[PDB]
Amino acid sequence: ASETRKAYTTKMIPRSHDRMKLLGNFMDYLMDGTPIFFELWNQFGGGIDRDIISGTANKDKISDDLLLAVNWFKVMPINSKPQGVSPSNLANLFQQYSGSEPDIQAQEYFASNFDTEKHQWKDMRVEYERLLAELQLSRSDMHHDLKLMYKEKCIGLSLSTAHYITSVMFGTGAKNNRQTKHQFYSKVIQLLELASIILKAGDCDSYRKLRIRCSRKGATPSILKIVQDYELGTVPSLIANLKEKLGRFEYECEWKCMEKIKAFLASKVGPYYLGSYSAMLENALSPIKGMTTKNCKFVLKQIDAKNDIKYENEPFGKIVEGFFDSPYFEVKWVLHPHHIGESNIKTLWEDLNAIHSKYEEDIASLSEDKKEKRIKVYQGDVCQTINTYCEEVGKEAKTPLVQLLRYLYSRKDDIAVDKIIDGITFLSKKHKVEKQKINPVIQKYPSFNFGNNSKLLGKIISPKDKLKHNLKCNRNQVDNYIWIEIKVLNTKTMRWEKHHYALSSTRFLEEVYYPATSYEGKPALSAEQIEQIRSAPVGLRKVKKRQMRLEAARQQNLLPRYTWGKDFNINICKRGNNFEVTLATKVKKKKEKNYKVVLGYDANIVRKNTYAAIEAHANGDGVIDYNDLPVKPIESGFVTVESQVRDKSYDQLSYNGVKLLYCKPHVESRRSFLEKYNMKDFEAIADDETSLYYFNMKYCKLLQSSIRNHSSQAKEYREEIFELLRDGKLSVLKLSSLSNLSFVMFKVAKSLIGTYFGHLLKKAPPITDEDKQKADPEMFALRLALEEKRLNKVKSKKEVIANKIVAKALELRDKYGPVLIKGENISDTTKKGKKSSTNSFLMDWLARGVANKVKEMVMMHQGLEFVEVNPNFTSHQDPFVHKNPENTFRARYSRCTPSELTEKNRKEILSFLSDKPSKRPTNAYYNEGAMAFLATYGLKKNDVLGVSLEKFKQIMANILHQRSEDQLLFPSRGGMFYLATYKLDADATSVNWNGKQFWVCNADLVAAYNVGLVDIQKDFKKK
DNA sequence: CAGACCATCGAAGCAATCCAGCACGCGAAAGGACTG
DNA sequence: CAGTCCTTTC
DNA sequence: AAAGGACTG
RNA sequence: AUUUUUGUGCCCAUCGUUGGCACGCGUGCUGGAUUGCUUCGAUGGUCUGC
User: Which of A769, A795, A821 is the last residue of a domain?
Assistant: First the structure.
């Protein structure tokens, strides 16, 4: 039984200045009262101590000392009341309290990094003492009270729901059946320590009503006791649960100091109301308990990570870090393994040791006075080798520091190679683990959820009561506004009074609200509705069209019934003088395990994210027998989202813009401006086949470089920058798709504005964002426009890709059965070792974003389920033959004509053929792919590794002409057209390799199938 | 062979953005009182 | 009693 | 322990 | 309790054919990166008599 929330983000229509001011006063009252509860609960937690937490003692792995340190040592902003503790003396303070020194978990908590500029430790136990002093309540009485709170889960970790805490500590009356319930439970266990129903009924109770009226009154029935009795009249492991619940129901809830605390709250906050106090405490506890749990898990993670630091490589770390106090360095920084080609330095030192052996054997002979020259030659050779290594490893990752490698080689006798790697990775991991900031306890900006059951009373009126009201008072009965009846506290006269406010969210109408007076599509409108749509102002026409479609669907009985149910929350966040009603809604799923389809998707960056469906227990013509599971490919395609312009049909995700054949004035203006500032590179971007957003991106980079060169006149660039990014018909803001290139375009636009500002404000105080806002307010506004446009662009890309994925999942669910959407677990990209360009490229991936959006959407549909799989080798594994018997791991190719072969392709083929050891597992797969490429056409690598790439193209053309085919497959590390043994593409062109007769599928579709077979066995057990 | 010019590549500082994780909120069901 | 609200407990 | 996942429209 | 004028937005050389289409919101921190300026250091090369 899973559940998630919807959200409809409505718009508050000001009913009247008086009513809106009343609502604002109520909101301000709640907001002003929230900090009081925040501080009060910080004090309560501060009062925690041993003999308070030594009760249930239930906790995952948190030490009894870490709980104490968490509840009375919190990092908060410097500008707060509890201020006054420095990190150094945290240990001795924790010694002063609790009569013991910090343990490992509490030592890690105290010795945690943070931002000393903004956040400061805080004693949090002088705050409890200040509560005792300023409310003058006996320390013993407050000790009893907060011990009772802890046992009631009103303080500590895993707190209870705010409503419950308020009702318990500040409530009128009670069951008072604590001792009564304890006796009942002791009797029940004594009768155990449908038959259980008889045993429970033996509590001097005839039926459920009697025991309800005797043991547990005025609440929901105790754990499966009254419901159990009813079920049994209309397993033995529960004894431990009932015995551990006996800790409760023993105290009788006598508060020795909650009266004084309640009076203090009434002094600071208004008079006690369960709804108001519950809301304020709900918005005050969230930061407290949230950051408490976050820091507990964080400290556990920190101890686990520090246990992974070897700490025996520390001397090697010292030797390597001696780089900073050596002639080769000219400030000081941390050394990460990417500075030495993390694992390639082994090959580097192999080569350098070969050179050293040659040099030494040459120095043994030639013992004349030529040493001063031979050593110089050897020094030059080793320097050249190190430079070549840095250049070589600087293609797939960051260039290793030349000076660091020179220093390491100079210290070739003080440290080995594996020891160099261990020391530097120690320097890296220790530094990382030591810079992990601890989460501060920051105050939440409140939400104040109005509901019906346990929150501040309130409700959307109804679709039914709406008709009653709109008919009682003469009205169309089909208004486009949603009315909420909120119980507002009139702060003038401190009493409650339900008022009404109008929301105007059209989605709520279209989807769950509008009444069925008489997933779907849309209706056919009438003439007058069309006229209204066409007569509305420009900015209102879209919402008018949506509303008229809704109205037509109601008038033509095309509007499905929406089964109101009155299950909507109302979240009112008052930022300034405007409200932010939200209308959340619970959705319940009842997850299913007996899957019938698997819908993997590959989640590419530039290559048109694909899906691929796989059946579970297929029985038909093609049913591939996996390890022990009969599976069948249903289909596989691309995720293309269609925006149908007048007659064409674009893919927002891959359109890439118009072809510059219709942007000639645009390109002419750009060239005219660029000519004024120094153009053989412009002509390479302005071809009439080049697409518009490639042209815009490349021209943004051109402007960036131009501004860099003409630094002292970057103010002259602003007219062109505007005309390119904002104003003109073909601009980054006027015209841009969801394609990856259209996001690189916004990235380069933001970079262009950044360089314009950096060179417009450079003459040394730093250039703060306020300084550049004041320097060119229009350009800063343009920067904000680009940022907001790109953020909404990203939100829409996530939403639409996830919509297509979930739509195909629903199609398969309707056709076959419960679907399982398997997505790559694309984490830990954008690494330090990678190049800056690689990390920037991978930032636009939005893999985890789409995965999260699909995860959310799947929680609302019954039948779908989303698991995230390991993305390892999912682009090479041959689907349905890899792991069906044994791993296959073929390579990806690139069909092309011999005339369009480039130098890069030939060099890549040679790199595959060159028998050199590499740590990448896929090197073997692409090497065997290159061998098979040579075998297929008989190229005789010795004679194929030759020069004259033109001669290579001629030889390939002759080989492919002797055969009747037109294109040659050849392995490429970034090529499509994977070779599968099964037809997974639906456009696959069969081909003959050494002698296997593969299918030329699409690398995207086979990768989607692999994503659908990563752990197929786990999803489908043999049951 | 001394000297300067480009260029890219690292490191750090400074000021910014950004995708992402992750903790929390978006309570239920009951009885009594009340009202119609 | 239907529906409301206000409370306590799960 | 990375690599892999991505492959610069 | 009636405001009849809006939830957020996304795509397009013709911005409408009723254009086409999608959507969980908020707070707060944290992690990893990126962007821009500068400083420093390496790396590669053209150039002037040598």
Answer: A795
Domain-embedded: residue A1015? no
CB A173 within 8 A of CB A158: no
Bases along strand B below 7 A from a protein CB = 7, 9-12, 14-32
- A327: three-class secondary structure by DSSP: coil
Closest CA to A159 of A270, A37, A272, A263: A37
Strands A610-615 and A633-638: antiparallel
Using the structure, give the distance in angstroms from the CA atom of A332 to the C1' atom of B12, rounded to a whole number: 8
CA of A190 to C1' of E27 (A): 49
Residue A13 and residue A25 in one domain:
no
Whole-number Å distance, CA A160 to C1' E50? 87
> Among A140, A65, A150, A55, which Cα is nearest to A103's?
A65
Angle between helices A17-46 and A258-268 (to 10 degrees): 140
**Closest nucleotide relative to residue A836's CA, C1' based:** E34
Q: Which nucleotides of D are covered by protein (CB under 7 A)?
A: 1-9
| Residue A372 token pair | 């001063």
Q: Which two tokens stand for residue A452?
A: 């019906």
Residue A986 identity (one-letter amino acid): A
Name the domain count of chain A.
7
Elucidation method: cryo-EM
Q: Which of these three, A747, A778, A795, is where a domain ends?
A: A795
Distance, in Å, from the CA atom of A260 to the CA atom of A271, rounded to the nearest integer, reads 13
Continuous segment of H or E residues that includes residue A824:
strand A819-824
Instruction: Classify residue A991: in a domain, yes or no.
Output: yes
In angstroms, the CA of A747 and the C1' of E44 are apart by: 29
- What's the CA gap between A21 and A792, in Å, rounded? 32
In a shared domain, residues A206 and A162? no
Task: End-to-end CA distance of chain A: give it in Å, rounded.
Answer: 22
A780 and A699 share a domain? yes
User: Are A981 and A885 contacting, i.e. CB atoms less than 8 angstroms apart?
Assistant: no
Q: Helices A692-709 and A664-676 sit at what angle, rounded to 10 degrees?
A: 10
Measured from Cα to the C1' atom, the residue closest to C10 is A220
Residues 600-629 of A with CB under 7 A from strand D: 602-607
Indicate the Cα dihedral angle A422, A424, A425, A428, nearest 10°: 160
Closest nucleotide over all strands to A454 (CA to C1')? B27
Any strand D atom closer than 7 Å to A873 CB: yes
Residue A489, domain member (yes or no): yes
The structure tokens listed for A479 are: 């208004």
Q: Which residue is nearest to nucleotide B9 (CA to C1')?
A: A399
Distance from C-alpha of A80 to C-alpha of A567, rounded to nearest angstrom: 39
**∠ CA(A965), CA(A968), CA(A969), 5° rounding?**
130
Do A412 and A496 fall into the same domain? no
The answer to whether residues A579 and A628 belong to one domain is: no
What is the C-alpha to C-alpha distance for residues A169 and A150, in angstroms, rounded to an integer? Answer: 12
Residue A479 CA distance to nucleotide B36 C1' (Å): 28
In a domain, A1022, yes or no: no
Shared domain check, A408 and A391: yes
Query: Is A581 in a helix, a strand, or coil?
Result: coil
Amino acid at A297: K
Chain breaks in chain A (C to N over 2.5 A) after: 193, 234, 330, 518, 678, 763
Nucleic strand D contacts from chain A, 576-605, CB < 7 Å: 602-605
**Residues in chain A, overall count:** 1023
- Which residue approaches E40 most closely, CA to C1'? A330
Do residues A874 and A868 touch, judged by C-beta distance below 8 A? no
Residue from A33, A49, A34, A32 nearest A128 by CA: A49
Same domain, A152 and A276: yes
Q: Is the sign of the CA dihedral A15, A16, A17, A18 positive or negative?
A: negative
Whole domain around residue A236: which residue ranges? Answer: 178-247
Please indicate, yes or no, whether residues A391 and A286 belong to a single structural domain of this protein.
no
Tell me the C-alpha to C-alpha distance, in Å, between residue A32 and each of A26, A418, A636: 10, 60, 56
